[PDB]
């Protein structure tokens, strides 16, 4: 089943931005030494993404509390992860995240991958716990408490068991562009190695589509599963987790924009320009080039929009002779007929 | 650094109509030229050659206070024989 954990305390996190990150291949065609303009939902340049520590030390003593709150899901999410000990293990998607509604789940079962879609009874604090002891042979014994029950699940996937661990600044970073569109679950992913980092560094890398999943379900919310290096029954304070949750992840929300992508001769996306960021970017987009010589260029046309629509016809008149008809004290007979004129 | 010229419109109007980058009144001195509303450049009393043609005798150039300045064009060095 599941284990009830402590309160998240609604801790206030810091923030950071994707400095020209998150561009993927929106099409299944190959172009060489071209510049293209694409209308598609991307991650805006220099936009602020919310970053979550895997383990948050409210105090340096070891008051470590997991930081993985529920987050809305609108038009897909960009998910970055910096880590070196596979602390992140998967994600869970749905609308209400219970047996009331259909839901989707991707998890890492110790060394395999699992993809399941049905109406899981997710608990309030789903997690994977792993703990070891030098005595005997424990070596990262695990407890899986992600959901309660699963019924009538349609799609299933299992894979081969393989992943090592430590059971030193080579924090690897993983990028994902999760988007549910047309009943499909496109997962653009990229794995790249970086070293000598504390937060996400500034860099450029095209993101490739790993897999599409036919799920055809309603999705309005999502969560994450983090590998607990501890156990709720005997929770240690410090060093129970991994480097006090220095390894972390970052969540950004995509918006539908236009982008100018530069395919080199090898077909690998090298540079990108966001048209809706700066007047100079608009000039570059309208010139279909990355360098612009000295001069004055006309990009677009600006117009003022009406604020409120107003309709008026002339009410100008007197009240009207109706009360003397309906509210009259006496009424005429049925043969001496009383018609009153109204104008 | 660049400048934005709304061609043929008073400056009491630019910030609030259009629905992207924003302008901000403090973003510049918001010069008012005969050609329109100019944003992002200062005004210099001195006159030089027309580096960039704006219109109505106004020309803009770059100097290292905004990096872009706009001035009234000088037809040439004055001489008397």
């Amino acid at each position, epitope marked *: 089943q599941c284990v009830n954990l402590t309160t998240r305390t609604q801790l206030p996190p810091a923030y950071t931005n994707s400095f020209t990150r998150g561009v993927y291949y929106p099409d299944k065609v190959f172009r060489s030494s071209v510049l293209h303009s694409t209308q598609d939902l991307f991650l805006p340049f220099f936009s602020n993404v919310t970053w979550f520590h895997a383990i948050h030390v409210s105090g340096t003593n070891g008051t470590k509390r997991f930081d993985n709150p529920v987050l809305p899901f609108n038009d897909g999410v960009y998910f970055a992860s910096t880590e070196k000990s596979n602390i992140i293990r998967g994600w869970i998607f749905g609308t209400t995240l219970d047996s009331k509604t259909q839901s989707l789940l991707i998890v890492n079962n110790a060394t395999n991958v699992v993809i399941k879609v049905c109406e899981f009874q997710f608990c309030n604090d789903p997690f994977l716990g792993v703990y070891y002891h030098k005595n005997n042979k424990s070596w990262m014994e695990s407890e899986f408490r992600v959901y309660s029950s699963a019924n009538n699940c349609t799609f299933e996937y299992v894979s081969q068991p393989f992943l090592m661990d430590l059971e030193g600044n080579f924090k690897n970073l993983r990028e994902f562009v999760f988007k549910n569109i047309d009943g499909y679950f496109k997962i653009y992913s990229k794995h790249t190695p970086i070293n000598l980092v504390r937060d996400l560094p500034q860099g450029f890398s095209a993101l490739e589509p790993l897999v599409d999943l036919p799920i055809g379900i309603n999705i309005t919310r999502f969560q994450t599963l983090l590998a607990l290096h501890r156990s709720y029954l005997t929770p240690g304070d410090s060093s129970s987790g991994w480097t006090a949750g220095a390894a972390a992840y970052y969540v950004g929300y995509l918006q539908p924009r236009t982008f100018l992508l530069k395919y080199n001769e090898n077909g690998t996306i090298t540079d990108a320009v966001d048209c809706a960021l700066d007047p100079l970017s608009e000039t570059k987009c309208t010139l279909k080039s990355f360098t612009v010589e000295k001069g004055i260029y006309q990009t677009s046309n600006f117009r003022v929009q009406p604020t409120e629509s107003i309709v008026r016809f002339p009410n100008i008149t007197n009240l009207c002779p109706f009360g003397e008809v309906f509210n009259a004290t006496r009424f005429a007979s049925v043969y001496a007929w009383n018609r009153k004129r109204i104008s | 650094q660049v400048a934005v010229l709304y061609q043929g419109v008073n400056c009491t109007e630019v910030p609030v109509a259009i629905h992207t980058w924003r302008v*901000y009144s*403090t973003g510049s001195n918001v010069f008012q030229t005969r050609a329109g509303c100019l*944003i992002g450049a200062e005004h210099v009393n001195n006159s030089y050659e027309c580096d960039i043609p704006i219109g109505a005798g106004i020309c803009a150039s770059y100097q290292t206070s905004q990096s872009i300045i706009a001035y009234t064009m000088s037809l040439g060095a004055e001489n008397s024989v």
Partner: nanobody
Amino acid sequence: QVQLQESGGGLVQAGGSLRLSCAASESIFRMELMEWYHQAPGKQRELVATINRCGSTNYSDSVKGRFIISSDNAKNSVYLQMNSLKDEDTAVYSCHARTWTSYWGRGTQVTVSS
């Protein structure tokens, strides 16, 4: 929409500490460069400190060791903690940030009694 508005100047004693809180409504990170300038009475304006988007920071000779730059990435603002103030630092300290177009605030006055 005042933008780059400064606050935190006024009367202070020599050797004390003070804080000023130039903060802007626009996104802090898109600035890519923001600096500090002060204008001593009877003296032309002079650059104080600088910070770009990458994180590189430079100070002039009369800056290093006494007050350094910082910018919390929780509320959009830049922090320059005035420490151990002297009588020759009396000026009109101003903050400036430049996106595609330059921005300027009115600055704040700082006076040190000695």
